[PDB]
Scaffold this active site. Sequence first.
Site, PDB file in Angstrom:
ATOM      1  N   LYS A 119       0.737  -1.235  -0.029  1.00  0.00           N
ATOM      2  CA  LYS A 119      -0.044  -0.012   0.076  1.00  0.00           C
ATOM      3  C   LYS A 119       0.706   1.221  -0.037  1.00  0.00           C
ATOM      4  O   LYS A 119       1.744   1.288   0.822  1.00  0.00           O
ATOM      5  CB  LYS A 119      -0.977   0.045   1.256  1.00  0.00           C
ATOM      6  CG  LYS A 119      -1.744   1.211   1.363  1.00  0.00           C
ATOM      7  CD  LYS A 119      -2.627   1.243   2.699  1.00  0.00           C
ATOM      8  CE  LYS A 119      -3.551   2.508   3.054  1.00  0.00           C
ATOM      9  NZ  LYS A 119      -3.772   2.439   4.469  1.00  0.00           N
ATOM     10  N   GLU A 146     -11.104  12.487  11.635  1.00  0.00           N
ATOM     11  CA  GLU A 146     -10.019  11.864  12.151  1.00  0.00           C
ATOM     12  C   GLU A 146      -9.135  12.425  13.186  1.00  0.00           C
ATOM     13  O   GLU A 146      -8.538  13.248  13.011  1.00  0.00           O
ATOM     14  CB  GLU A 146      -9.083  11.130  11.235  1.00  0.00           C
ATOM     15  CG  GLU A 146      -8.518   9.852  11.488  1.00  0.00           C
ATOM     16  CD  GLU A 146      -7.433   9.165  10.577  1.00  0.00           C
ATOM     17  OE1 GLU A 146      -6.309   8.422  10.943  1.00  0.00           O
ATOM     18  OE2 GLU A 146      -7.723   9.282   9.502  1.00  0.00           O
ATOM     19  N   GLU A 185      -8.303  -4.533   4.992  1.00  0.00           N
ATOM     20  CA  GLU A 185      -7.494  -3.259   5.000  1.00  0.00           C
ATOM     21  C   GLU A 185      -7.496  -2.498   6.140  1.00  0.00           C
ATOM     22  O   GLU A 185      -6.541  -2.063   6.850  1.00  0.00           O
ATOM     23  CB  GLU A 185      -7.870  -2.421   3.948  1.00  0.00           C
ATOM     24  CG  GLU A 185      -7.756  -2.983   2.254  1.00  0.00           C
ATOM     25  CD  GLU A 185      -7.858  -2.020   1.040  1.00  0.00           C
ATOM     26  OE1 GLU A 185      -6.822  -2.075   0.222  1.00  0.00           O
ATOM     27  OE2 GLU A 185      -8.859  -1.485   1.069  1.00  0.00           O
ATOM     28  N   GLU A 197     -12.276   9.106  -6.293  1.00  0.00           N
ATOM     29  CA  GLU A 197     -12.300   9.005  -4.831  1.00  0.00           C
ATOM     30  C   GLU A 197     -11.584  10.217  -4.122  1.00  0.00           C
ATOM     31  O   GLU A 197     -12.439  10.930  -3.160  1.00  0.00           O
ATOM     32  CB  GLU A 197     -11.709   7.635  -4.267  1.00  0.00           C
ATOM     33  CG  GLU A 197     -12.010   7.230  -2.808  1.00  0.00           C
ATOM     34  CD  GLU A 197     -11.059   6.708  -1.959  1.00  0.00           C
ATOM     35  OE1 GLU A 197      -9.854   7.435  -1.759  1.00  0.00           O
ATOM     36  OE2 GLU A 197     -11.275   5.571  -1.372  1.00  0.00           O
ATOM     37  N   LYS A 253     -12.968  13.143  -1.725  1.00  0.00           N
ATOM     38  CA  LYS A 253     -12.672  13.578  -0.245  1.00  0.00           C
ATOM     39  C   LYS A 253     -12.315  15.020  -0.202  1.00  0.00           C
ATOM     40  O   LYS A 253     -12.830  15.709   0.808  1.00  0.00           O
ATOM     41  CB  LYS A 253     -11.310  12.766  -0.083  1.00  0.00           C
ATOM     42  CG  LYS A 253     -11.628  11.261   0.632  1.00  0.00           C
ATOM     43  CD  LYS A 253     -10.099  10.524   0.238  1.00  0.00           C
ATOM     44  CE  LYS A 253      -9.987   9.193   1.087  1.00  0.00           C
ATOM     45  NZ  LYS A 253      -8.706   8.547   0.525  1.00  0.00           N
TER      46      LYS A 253
END
Length: 429
Positions: free
Chosen positions: A190, A240, A284, A416, A420
């Site tokens: 990743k 987050e 993941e 994606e 975001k």
Amino acid sequence: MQSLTTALENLLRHLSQEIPATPGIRVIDIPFPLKDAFDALSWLASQQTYPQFYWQQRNGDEEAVVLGAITRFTSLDQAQRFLRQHPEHADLRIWGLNAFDPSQGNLLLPRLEWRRCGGKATLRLTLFSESSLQHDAIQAKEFIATLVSIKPLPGLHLTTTREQHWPDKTGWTQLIELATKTIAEGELDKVVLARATDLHFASPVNAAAMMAASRRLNLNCYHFYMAFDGENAFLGSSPERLWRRRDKALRTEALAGTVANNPDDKQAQQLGEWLMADDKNQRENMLVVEDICQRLQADTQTLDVLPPQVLRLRKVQHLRRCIWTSLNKADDVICLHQLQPTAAVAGLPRDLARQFIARHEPFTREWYAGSAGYLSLQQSEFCVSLRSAKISGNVVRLYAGAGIVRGSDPEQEWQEIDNKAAGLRTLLQ
């Protein structure tokens, strides 16, 4: 601003008492009547003094706006070093940002800190001097004289002069297929790679107004805003948490696995109940928790991973697992260096993923995907500096990243990153 005026006059009264002309530190806390809410952001943006930092914890109960740097710190380590030299003010907070590179920070011990905890607020004034408290008391007096009345937030203007992506679409595939080449081969699996979108406006963009706009739409998010000076600011609304430390109690979280949101409660909730059953994202996500526990284990006692939940945000939903534990040592430099950059923002393994980003990215992340918040001896909380923007005069630079993994595909991951970035782009366009 009758609350503010009254508080300022109590403060000036205190500064007119005898202050000793010797080295030292004083903390002056004035109760702040919160009979109405106080538009701390509007107040901050009315001032011509820099730096300014504004922060609201994602739950909406904790908020601060701080103005004017008694001392600046270029790393969190140097910040904590200062605080440890003053253990008698355990709640003395230092405010600001840590860069994507965590050895670099922009943090301050503020002149003035207004801080609300939910229902109660405090306007706090500090004095500090290597030499004379009486001397710095003079500075504080002058700094107060400097403050101006709350003005309406200025307006956002919506006229665009240009739009650049770094990297653009072809450079994105150029880089993505490079990265999967590299995944194909070695032991990297990743790597999270970013895009910058530079929006050029015909007028200079007011950053506090952009922040105020974000707070209305981007719910359940930490809101953070640093005005470095009149021309430059960095701000975001991140869902987050990097860490929260209360004494030695630590909370962090593995927030990974993205879907889009939908405004109808049922279709968003079908899009989410799906996410929770998709073996793969759950895998993941679980590799993210393992990495966090690994990074944490030598510095903590038992680690508790909580059940997965879907976190529904405005444009986008995430799978999250929270991880609570106790630290061996009440130490913020350990939390920082152990937890940043996250596996969710670099990738996996840690070294290899950071090394790809370092080797290959066409722009510096600078403050994007660092952290924002505060530390004191007693407690600290930083959010990851996601869903963020750098503002320099007339240019606004939005940041968003995607975790390339093997089958990836340019255009899907790009879509994606658009989503975001959306949480901020929609306030401006």
